[PDB]
Amino acid sequence: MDINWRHNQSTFYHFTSDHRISGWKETNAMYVALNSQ
Amino acid sequence: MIREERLLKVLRAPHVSEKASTAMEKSNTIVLKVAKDATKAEIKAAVQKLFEVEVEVVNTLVVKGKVKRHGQRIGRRSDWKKAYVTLKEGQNL
Amino acid sequence: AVVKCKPTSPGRRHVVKVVNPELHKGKPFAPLLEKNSKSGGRNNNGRITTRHIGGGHKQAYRIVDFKRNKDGIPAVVERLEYDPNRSANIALVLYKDGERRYILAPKGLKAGDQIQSGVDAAIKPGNTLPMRNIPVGSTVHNVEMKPGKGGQLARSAGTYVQIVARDGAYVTLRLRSGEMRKVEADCRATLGEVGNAEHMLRVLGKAGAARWRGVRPTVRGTAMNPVDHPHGGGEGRNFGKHPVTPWGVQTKGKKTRSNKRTDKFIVRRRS
Amino acid sequence: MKRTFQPSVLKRNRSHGFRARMATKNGRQVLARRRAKGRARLTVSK
RNA sequence: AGGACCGAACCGACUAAUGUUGAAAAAUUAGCGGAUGACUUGUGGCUGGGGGUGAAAGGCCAAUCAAACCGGGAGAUAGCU
RNA sequence: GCUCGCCGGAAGACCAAGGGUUCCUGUCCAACGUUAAUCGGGGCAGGGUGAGUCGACCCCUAAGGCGAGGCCGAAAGGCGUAGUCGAUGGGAAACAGGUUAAUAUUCCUGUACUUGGUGUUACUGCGAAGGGGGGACGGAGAAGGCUAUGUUGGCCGGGCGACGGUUGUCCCGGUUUAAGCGUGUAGGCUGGUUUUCCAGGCAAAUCCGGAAAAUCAAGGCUGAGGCGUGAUGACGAGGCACUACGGUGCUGAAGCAACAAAUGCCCUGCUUCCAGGAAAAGCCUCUAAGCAUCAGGUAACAUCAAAUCGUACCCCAAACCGACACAGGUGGUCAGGUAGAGAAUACCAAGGCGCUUGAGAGAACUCGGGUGAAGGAACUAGGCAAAAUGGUGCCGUAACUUCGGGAGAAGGCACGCUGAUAUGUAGGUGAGGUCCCUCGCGGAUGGAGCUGAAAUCAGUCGAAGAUACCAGCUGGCUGCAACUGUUUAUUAAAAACACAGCACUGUGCAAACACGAAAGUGGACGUAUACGGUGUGACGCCUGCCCGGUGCCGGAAGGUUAAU
């Protein structure tokens, strides 16, 4: 359980996805930034 | 011919179970654990010459070893080989 | 015979076929066939060296006799066949000693027709013979460039080469290019012109026809990004550059012959 | 959805197996580092 | 006959709604396009990082791509926090 | 255990890949199981995988890998000849029934087949990393002959029935049988046989190829299925005797015919079309060197051998890939009934499941749905969403057009059930009988029986007959793109990319060009009617002027101009 918890905390450490906050969290930040311009 | 020094090392134990038992008491076949590298000619010759009976035909399967564990330490057992030795009409053992 | 297809279903609207009723409907002659594996345009390094190649139909190679070595033995043309590896058709011929060979089919040549290779051959279309024995001003195909080597000039369909001069050990040849080239006069050549001229009149009609001759699509350079092709980029259509290959060498004019070894043999470049 | 690891034993072995590490200079250096690090299984064989 | 027509398998992914700490790190449901072809699929093989491949989008190259991943130079450098 | 619901071209069954004991039995409930658990794919122990014929190994090869020498390269190393590996392909052979809690084409019963070794006997020219054949192989389409399978009748066994009727044009069930061996059919292909001669198949050849004759008109090859045997056997609905009520033994009737019919088989066929459709071995043949009263070949018989590894279990999934017992992904094989064109769809059979939290209540609100007065886009960025349309036959159908289309334009009418025509027709199939015989798996006649649309007329029911499910909304003007396609895996499917077609330009073959310190390889076993690059992008009418700038091509006089 401890090994699975360390690896499953280590899941989104090297991500790329920009529309999702922290790799996973859905948001509207594309529209927020885009409307700020 | 097969040398007798080879031919003694092949048979290893008689196999006791209920499939073995019904094979003896129903179809003349004695089931026995053999050497892992033992061919069917060696098992046939070794039952011909070590229990002095007449063997009709041998059928050999190989049984895979079970991964057991002690405590939190695993281990596979060990593969062995099982020979279904079908005797002729005149036999005892 | 060229035939416009009737325009049922687009795709057939613009197709022109070149049908030939005298080609053999059936299997080719087997012991002159061999495996011809398709490459994809890719060398022994795996890399695409020639672009736009790949797919298409499976093809078997046909050993065509370009050398024409059986001299003095006559041969009757057994039949004409479709060859997938070429523009022209191939004639299967039967020599008098019982050896069949495929040759390139010249223009007039039908089934049941005598051809004959060698020095003392009659001058009539189909006979391969050395060019010191052919008259000047004769159409001639399947020309050798080195004696004994095999034919390499005028092999593609409807193509001939005219012999214009016999100055010494050399014959001046008007190649189909328009180029005047000197060839050694001991080089064999086959009389007549090679015979499927109407090949150039077909029109293919759709995209998949090109695809089934093994010609993958051609992305044009200006549609790419600048990292890909020198033409690249630009906010709608934007050319602005002198037209080049994908490797920067000027297309549209720039001469790319450098031999210096065979410049002796070129009397006049093409025009 | 079709994930990246679609297993095949024959491609596992032809690709990353022992006879294929030993087949070249750099795979032998791979095996040398795995032995030197001291590793229970060197290649992926079975 | 047909890169033919309608339409299942099969391939896809046009719209909407849900979902958005999901059942799912891209789906479900209802409709939707192709469906004998430039189709689709299984098994194997080949191409490799300023390199591949690209019916071209800077797309794709193991959930990573205006230059992969791993290890090293390496405690780079950081007049900045 | 009885009911109820769900899937049933799957949510059934069998595998491959992948996993690796999850399989089966006994036992335990700590943790794992989104709850409880006596249960479990959990814990512990024991058991379980039986092969000459299935698969692998093996023989042969494709793509491709590796590669003695070799060519090449600062070194590492690249390429590659001989070779050697490499299946996803080619190559010998087994089927039915029974059995275990758990394996079975493997065990048992019955009946078989294949390939090698050895021995005997009879005849005898055998012999290759060599020659020839063969293996040997496309897309589409069309029927014909069959079968699997199903339906109905006959037969056989059982029932006469909780509620009106049910001894009959009644109800329920069964009606199965293989490989192998023998026969040779519906098809399909090909003229056959004998003699002589030859510049071909690196040599040889009796084989192949070729050229002459002569004669006969048939022979040969291949082939589904049927039929006979296998099989007076097995299986068989059910009864009988004991019954650790789990079953265990014994016995066992009929076991036929007609029709329908595949996407399976004849068929690797046939017709056709361009886009012109693997290789090598096994196999059959020919001989060379050699061996020639020997060895070897062929045939019969006998005898021996056929090793090794896999075999459990899941396999559209709770066992594989997805961190999960995850609404996702995952190749092949089998494919019953009724309605239906159908593998759609509805309801069902075989079979398998009810999705590992439940009990209530019946607020707002959210999600998925049903219906809605009058109105009917007034909503809105926009008819988004929903509603509507929807089948078959017949009538009918405009502009425009590349003469194909548009077109399913548009718009209509008919549709159930019953009866008659006709105790079910047209059609399909086709027995007994009869006739002939080159006599049988034959052809001619004949129509019993079975199957069976579709139409008209008459009648009848309902509000409604395409009644459910399933199943086009239509028309008008216009921009872009000719069209089918492709693309931003994961906010963009588009007018963008592609495309056929056009043009310009390079390229004479050791081609230009590309990958490569090089060797080499692709271009291409191609040769200018070809190949590469660039732009434009079907088709129709067309494509005007400018060479001063930048580029390219050509020129060589003069100026300037490096190493030396």
Author numbering:
A (entry chain s): 120 to 156
B (entry chain g): 1 to 93
C (entry chain P): 2 to 272
D (entry chain p): 1 to 46
The authors write:
One of the most recently discovered examples is the Vibrio export monitoring polypeptide (VemP) that allows Vibrio alginolyticus to adapt to changes in salinity by modulating expression of components of the protein targeting machinery. The switch between SecDF1 and SecDF2 is facilitated by the stalling activity of VemP. In Na+-limiting environments, however, VemP is not translocated due to the inactivity of SecDF1, and the resulting lack of force on the VemP nascent chain leads to ribosomal stalling. Ribosome stalling dissolves the stem-loop structure within the mRNA, exposes the RBS and thereby induces expression of Na+-independent SecDF2.
In order to investigate which residues of VemP are involved in establishing interactions with the exit tunnel during ribosome stalling, and in particular to decipher the molecular mechanism of force-sensitive ribosome stalling by VemP, we used cryo-EM to determine the structure of a VemP-stalled ribosome-nascent chain complex (VemP-SRC). Since we observed a contribution of the amino acids in VemP beyond the initially identified stalling window and to ensure the maximum ribosome stalling efficiency, the wildtype VemP sequence lacking only the signal sequence (residues 26–159, ΔSS-VemP), rather than a shorter stalling window, was used. Subsequent refinement resulted in a final reconstruction of the VemP-SRC with an average resolution of 2.9 Å and a local resolution of 2.5 Å within the core of the ribosome. The VemP nascent chain adopts an extremely compacted conformation within the exit tunnel comprising two α-helices, located in the upper and lower regions of the tunnel, connected by an α-turn and loop. The α-helix located in the upper region of the tunnel is comprised of the C-terminal 10 residues (N147–Q156) of VemP and is directly linked to the P-tRNA and thereby located directly in the peptidyltransferase center (PTC) of the ribosome. The α-helix located in the lower region of the tunnel is comprised of the N-terminal 10 residues (M120–S129) of VemP for which density is clearly visualized. The linker between the two α-helices is located within the constriction of the exit tunnel, adjacent to ribosomal proteins uL4 and uL22. Structurally, the extensive compaction and secondary structure formation of VemP results in an unprecedented total of 37 residues being housed within the upper two thirds (approximately 50–55 Å) of the ribosomal exit tunnel, which contrasts with the 21–33 aa that were visualized within the exit tunnel for other stalling peptides, such as SecM, MifM, TnaC and CMV. Comparison of the conformation of nucleotides at the PTC of the VemP-stalled ribosomes revealed two nucleotides of the 23S rRNA, U2585 and U2506, which adopt conformations incompatible with peptide bond formation.
